[PDB]
Amino acid sequence: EITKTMKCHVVSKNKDEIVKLLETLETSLIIDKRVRLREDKNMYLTLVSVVEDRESDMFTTGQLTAVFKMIGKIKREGPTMDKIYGNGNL
Amino acid sequence: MRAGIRKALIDNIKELKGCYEPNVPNKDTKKPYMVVVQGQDNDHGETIGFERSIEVWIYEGRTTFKKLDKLTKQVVEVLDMNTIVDESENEAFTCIYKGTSENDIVVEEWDAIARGIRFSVIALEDKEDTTNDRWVEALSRHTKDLLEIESYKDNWKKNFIAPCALWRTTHIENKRINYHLIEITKTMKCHVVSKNKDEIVKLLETLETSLIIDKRVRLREDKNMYLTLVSVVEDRESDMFTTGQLTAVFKMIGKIKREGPTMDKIYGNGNL
Amino acid sequence: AFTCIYKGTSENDIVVEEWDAIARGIRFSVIALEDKEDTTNDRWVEALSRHTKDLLEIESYKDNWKKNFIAPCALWRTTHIENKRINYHLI
Amino acid sequence: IEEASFLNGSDVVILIDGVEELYMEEIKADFEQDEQSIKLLGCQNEISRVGTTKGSFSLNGYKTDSKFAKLGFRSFEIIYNLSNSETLGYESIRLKNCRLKKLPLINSKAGEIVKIEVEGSFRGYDLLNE
Amino acid sequence: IEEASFLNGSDVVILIDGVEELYMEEIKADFEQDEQSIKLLGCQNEISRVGTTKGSFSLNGYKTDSKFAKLGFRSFEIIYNLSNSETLGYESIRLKNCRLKKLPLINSKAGEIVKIEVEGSFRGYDLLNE
Amino acid sequence: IEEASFLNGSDVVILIDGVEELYMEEIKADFEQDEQSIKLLGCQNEISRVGTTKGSFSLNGYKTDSKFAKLGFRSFEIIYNLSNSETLGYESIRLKNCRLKKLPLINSKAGEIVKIEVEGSFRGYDLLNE
Amino acid sequence: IEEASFLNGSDVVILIDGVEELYMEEIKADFEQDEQSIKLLGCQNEISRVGTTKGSFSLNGYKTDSKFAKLGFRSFEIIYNLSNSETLGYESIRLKNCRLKKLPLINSKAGEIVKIEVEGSFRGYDLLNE
Amino acid sequence: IEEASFLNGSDVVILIDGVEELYMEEIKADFEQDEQSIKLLGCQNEISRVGTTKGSFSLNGYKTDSKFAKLGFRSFEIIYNLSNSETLGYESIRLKNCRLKKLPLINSKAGEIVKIEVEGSFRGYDLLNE
């Protein structure tokens, strides 16, 4: 399991635009509860929690804090029993 | 360290006319020329040791500041994190870019403009790069083998070769879990330095994945010891040099080395 | 006796033209000027300092640093004490 | 490193008695059976058999209507679509003849949100998809 | 994104035996029934039936009078108006022939506020509104 | 906004066997009764009746004497005055023929204050005031 | 100071019914037996005997398929390889004729990851390796 | 102020079936007995007697081998040397004919260290030293 608490900024001359952009971004992240890691679509980043702190600085800190997790699988393999054979005696 | 910085500046810069010491150059010296001024040496903690501060004061003929800005970018390119060898001392170092002087001054009596670039050096008093922490040795060996970069031990050395890693122990917790067993726990933090920050991210990613998929580390090449991982965590916001990005917790269980005689042969007789 | 400790260097590497000289100020310090005893009425500190000296074969200063400490050395001060009457007869 | 997936519990879609129920929060259902442990007269290992089966289920969610109170002890069906979106292989299970063990008429605390908890039994189950 | 609503628990209004009781804090009531599980001689799925029903309820709230102590084990009615104000569709339930299981004469701790807890049973229920 | 009041639990005054007991910390008392649930042969709603009543009580407080140990299993009365001072309408209840279920001879932990806990039963109760 | 080792629980590899199951998180299994305590007529020490044995097991892990729901109450084998890598002496145990006590059709909460819990019994065990 | 001593639990040394077991973490053992309470026809104080005795024990520790699984329900001895080093008066107790109540074949969680828990009974005990 790989977890990342990724924070996001939104900059603009119009602060109301910052509020609107953060609102739509949060709503998108919530209603679509995961994100395509790559265009191949095999991987995904299931959301855990998205939180905004409007008081936080626009440039240094960043308004929106999101936590994503992903579950890898150890890439081990081995030979397979395609064919089985046996005889009978007494 | 004056000789090394002066030689590097003279060799790798061609607009430069000369790199002097503080009060050397006469008024007829040909501009642009640089001046290397050493600053304090301050104890900045266990991991960094003593940190020298060095300034490189560029000077120019008061034509325009764009020439000086170009020269400043050249100096930053030359000295930032590139290992430099001081032939006089016959020991190397690695300057680190830190900033710029308070303003971009103008000196009318000399008919010049100046700007002070601000460098620093790490771990002035460290010369060993050895440790008696066997765990740090084991993980530094593991990092060097996995990652094929330098792997310094408990404290930086003044001539570190970027990119590199540094493994150190911050906290140790021993515990007598049983009569015969003792548990030794260490929360060991790791640095990754490089000029390319994306390279830092990639190196940390591969190191973390290696530590996770291989859940233990060979303490010695003789085997029979292992550092079973407990938790490995990266804090990308943490400073590259002072703190270190990656925090790992390892534990090991010893055994009290007591022994006694053995009943190899037993004998007895019967009566009535 | 005393034991100076290296601490750093002057603010810059000054140049004094009127004297025709250059100067640099190294910065040392000394510890525990007003301590001269190296004794303690804390029996526990005495016991562990004795244990450290026997096990480790280095100096073991008891209550606080003394100005002439011999590196390498150890010190075994106590920070915090908590007493507790667990029972009528026991503490 | 090849991918994996956890079926997130927020993908559940429960259709109770046909209509899609959208306030349910957690659902449980198990198919019990009496072990019928038998001690043989010669063998020292106990033997277990299917016996007879019995269903049991439960649901918890935010109250928004008197649906369950008005439903009474009437039999009804439950569908449970545990959708998976990382891989599209959803899972659907049907519970047959669901009947409430106890009608939750009233349950509320003053300083809290009103939630409805249900528990009962079902005659049999069907695994429509997997 | 269309609206929704949860029934906040502070909207409950309980009229006990006609008079409006205004110190009650949480109320619970369920309509139990014996499952009467029957194992058929040919079918391996157990069958459940209504059996017989049994009521049970409870209330907790701040004590302000000896109302319940003086009431004794007399039968009485309980109304429970779970008002909804975001949507005006309130819900009202009547519990018939409520009788206390145990009279809470005294319950108090020195360093705390005195609360009264009640539990009992009711013969039947009516769903007046929903 | 008109006032209200909570009966603070520190207003309790307990007179045990006449003498005022001033170290008691929390007192509980309930009047139980067997429900005597009866299933009618034609009606599917169970019916409850008074049956027979039974008392039970308890007290906890700081130990200061061997009063309860010396009292033994003797019958005694308990008064409980839940005074209200915001409104002067105090409440007083009498428990008749209180008898200890178990004599608490010894209870003490070394690092703690010694407290005495009692539990028993009472034949009947009287509601002197409310 | 000579070494030691703890068998880390993440080294477990469970093959259920032949196929390697890779989402299982914790597995338990015990071999019970009735003590058959007998009181002798002359000796004051009770005596215990083997009686008859009974198996019981359990598994918990992240749900990824309807494997157990579709498996039903069919008998099956379980292998459990508690690998040790500090010393290469792994341990392998086989559980014979495993049968589920209850089929976990549905278990899920909205705000959580879906996990599957199983419990059952097994006729006998084999200790393949140690 | 004269000294005292607490027998630290890390001084325990357990030899199970002769061989010194060095991964055990906590051990419990008690010698039970049926009280055989008898009510006399004239005296109002109940009388207790020895009845018959029964042993019971338990151990928990880190798993390192299949010792207990391979041991089966065979009888065995346990020694328990609660050494004291502040005063050299160690204590040794022998448990006779220890037999497991349940064989702990498998117990492990993925994210944790594997521990082995055992419980059983013993015919009798001997107090070798004190």
Residue numbers in the entry:
A (entry chain d): 183 to 272
B (entry chain R): 1 to 272
C (entry chain P): 92 to 182
D (entry chain C), E (entry chain D), F (entry chain E), G (entry chain B), H (entry chain A): 7 to 136
Text of the article:
Here, we reveal the extended and contracted atomic structures of an intact contractile-tailed phage (φCD508) that binds to and penetrates the protective S-layer of the Gram-positive human pathogen Clostridioides difficile. The virion can be divided into five distinct regions: the head, neck, tail, baseplate, and needle. Structures of purified φCD508 virions in both extended and contracted conformations were determined by single-particle EM of frozen-hydrated samples; the resolution ranged from 2.6 to 4.0 Å for the extended phage, and 2.9 to 4.2 Å for the contracted form.
The neck links the capsid to the tail. The portal in turn connects to the neck, which is made up of three protein complexes with a VIRFAM type I neck arrangement, comprising one dodecameric ring (gp50) and two hexameric rings (gp51 and gp53). The symmetry is therefore reduced from 12-fold down to 6-fold, traveling down the neck. The first complex in the neck is the head-to-tail adaptor gp50, which assembles into a 12-fold symmetric ring and acts to resolve a symmetry mismatch between the portal and the tail. The neck valve protein gp51 forms a hexameric complex and represents the narrowest constriction in the neck lumen, ∼23 Å in diameter at its minimum. gp51 has structural homology to the “stopper” protein of SPP1, which is proposed to prevent DNA leakage from the capsid (RMSD ∼8 Å for 53 out of 80 Cɑ pairs). In our structure, strong density in the lumen of the channel weakens around the neck valve, suggesting the neck valve may also constitute the point at which DNA is prevented from exiting through the tail of the φCD508 before contraction. Below the constriction, a weaker density is present, which likely constitutes the tape measure protein gp59, although the enforced sixfold symmetry in the reconstruction prevents identification or building of a model into this region.
